[PDB]
Write a protein that holds these residues in place. Structure first.
Motif, PDB file in Angstrom:
ATOM      1  N   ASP A  33     -31.274  13.009 -24.679  1.00 47.28           N
ATOM      2  CA  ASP A  33     -29.929  13.572 -24.518  1.00 47.28           C
ATOM      3  C   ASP A  33     -29.576  14.508 -25.679  1.00 47.28           C
ATOM      4  N   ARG A  34     -30.078  14.194 -26.876  1.00 49.24           N
ATOM      5  CA  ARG A  34     -29.845  14.964 -28.096  1.00 49.24           C
ATOM      6  C   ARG A  34     -30.646  16.270 -28.194  1.00 49.24           C
ATOM      7  N   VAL A  35     -31.397  16.712 -27.184  1.00 46.33           N
ATOM      8  CA  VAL A  35     -32.171  17.960 -27.260  1.00 46.33           C
ATOM      9  C   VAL A  35     -31.698  18.875 -26.128  1.00 46.33           C
ATOM     10  N   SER A  36     -31.442  20.154 -26.420  1.00 47.90           N
ATOM     11  CA  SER A  36     -30.945  21.139 -25.456  1.00 47.90           C
ATOM     12  C   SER A  36     -31.475  22.530 -25.806  1.00 47.90           C
ATOM     13  N   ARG A  37     -31.487  23.446 -24.826  1.00 46.35           N
ATOM     14  CA  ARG A  37     -31.623  24.869 -25.121  1.00 46.35           C
ATOM     15  C   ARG A  37     -30.304  25.369 -25.713  1.00 46.35           C
ATOM     16  N   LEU A  38     -30.388  26.359 -26.597  1.00 41.58           N
ATOM     17  CA  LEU A  38     -29.266  27.049 -27.225  1.00 41.58           C
ATOM     18  C   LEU A  38     -29.540  28.544 -27.168  1.00 41.58           C
ATOM     19  N   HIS A  39     -28.490  29.335 -27.363  1.00 42.71           N
ATOM     20  CA  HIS A  39     -28.529  30.783 -27.469  1.00 42.71           C
ATOM     21  C   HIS A  39     -27.601  31.145 -28.627  1.00 42.71           C
ATOM     22  N   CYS A  40     -28.071  31.978 -29.556  1.00 42.26           N
ATOM     23  CA  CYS A  40     -27.415  32.276 -30.824  1.00 42.26           C
ATOM     24  C   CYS A  40     -27.582  33.766 -31.150  1.00 42.26           C
ATOM     25  N   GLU A  41     -26.788  34.251 -32.098  1.00 41.28           N
ATOM     26  CA  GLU A  41     -26.796  35.620 -32.596  1.00 41.28           C
ATOM     27  C   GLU A  41     -26.572  35.517 -34.103  1.00 41.28           C
ATOM     28  N   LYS A  96     -23.757  31.035 -29.117  1.00 38.77           N
ATOM     29  CA  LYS A  96     -23.146  31.811 -28.042  1.00 38.77           C
ATOM     30  C   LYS A  96     -23.089  30.991 -26.756  1.00 38.77           C
ATOM     31  N   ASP A  97     -24.082  30.129 -26.498  1.00 39.97           N
ATOM     32  CA  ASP A  97     -24.134  29.281 -25.304  1.00 39.97           C
ATOM     33  C   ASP A  97     -25.046  28.072 -25.552  1.00 39.97           C
ATOM     34  N   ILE A  98     -24.902  27.027 -24.733  1.00 41.13           N
ATOM     35  CA  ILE A  98     -25.610  25.754 -24.805  1.00 41.13           C
ATOM     36  C   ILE A  98     -26.053  25.442 -23.370  1.00 41.13           C
ATOM     37  N   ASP A  99     -27.290  24.967 -23.184  1.00 42.35           N
ATOM     38  CA  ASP A  99     -27.924  24.870 -21.865  1.00 42.35           C
ATOM     39  C   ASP A  99     -28.747  23.570 -21.729  1.00 42.35           C
ATOM     40  N   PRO A 100     -28.093  22.417 -21.471  1.00 47.25           N
ATOM     41  CA  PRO A 100     -28.683  21.065 -21.470  1.00 47.25           C
ATOM     42  C   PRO A 100     -29.715  20.724 -20.361  1.00 47.25           C
ATOM     43  N   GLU A 101     -30.512  21.672 -19.845  1.00 46.79           N
ATOM     44  CA  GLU A 101     -31.226  21.535 -18.559  1.00 46.79           C
ATOM     45  C   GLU A 101     -32.033  20.238 -18.387  1.00 46.79           C
ATOM     46  N   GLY A 102     -32.806  19.848 -19.405  1.00 45.48           N
ATOM     47  CA  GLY A 102     -33.915  18.909 -19.268  1.00 45.48           C
ATOM     48  C   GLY A 102     -33.795  17.813 -20.311  1.00 45.48           C
TER      49      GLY A 102
END
Length: 150
Positions: A23-31, A13-19
């Protein structure tokens, strides 16, 4: 054990590259697709093609494998070689951290939550108590992933 017992598909649903520690690791949001779960991850994203996300199949079909159903002398073959972690794109151990599910006071939170730390990655999850299939601190530590199969 490897005694089943749950498998489901998702859509990012969304991707959130904060930290960008990497570079290959990010927060994600899924359903989830077959059921109703609401999910957050902090995970390796090079599994996805590029920026956009894609549809996964998470699995908590238990793995096994502290012991000797495979360390017996197999797990060398076609679980890898031409096959891969692709029949199971990723697989890992972790720790679940959770209350009784409720934090409302009285609605007895109709979705059991879960928080998971696994190999340095993270999840934050909600779904119906039976459906989440992880009442225990020691069930969904057994964790496995692949692409969708359609």
């Amino acid at each position: 054990m490897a005694g089943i017992l749950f498998e489901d598909i998702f859509d990012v649903k969304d991707i959130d590259p904060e930290g960008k520690k990497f570079d290959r690791v990010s927060r994600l949001h899924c359903e989830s697709e077959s059921f109703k779960m609401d999910l957050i991850l902090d995970v390796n994203i090079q599994i996805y093609p590029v920026d956009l996300g894609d549809k996964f199949r998470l699995v908590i079909a238990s793995t096994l494998y502290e012991d000797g159903t495979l360390d017996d002398g197999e797990y060398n073959p076609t679980d890898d070689r031409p096959s891969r972690a692709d029949q199971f794109e990723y697989v890992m151990y972790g720790k679940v951290y959770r209350i009784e599910g409720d934090e409302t006071s009285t609605e007895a939170a109709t979705r059991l939550s879960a928080y998971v730390s696994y190999g340095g990655l993270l999840m934050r999850l909600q779904g119906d108590a039976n459906n989440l299939h992880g009442f225990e601190v020691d069930s969904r530590v057994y964790l496995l992933m692949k692409k969708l199969a359609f």
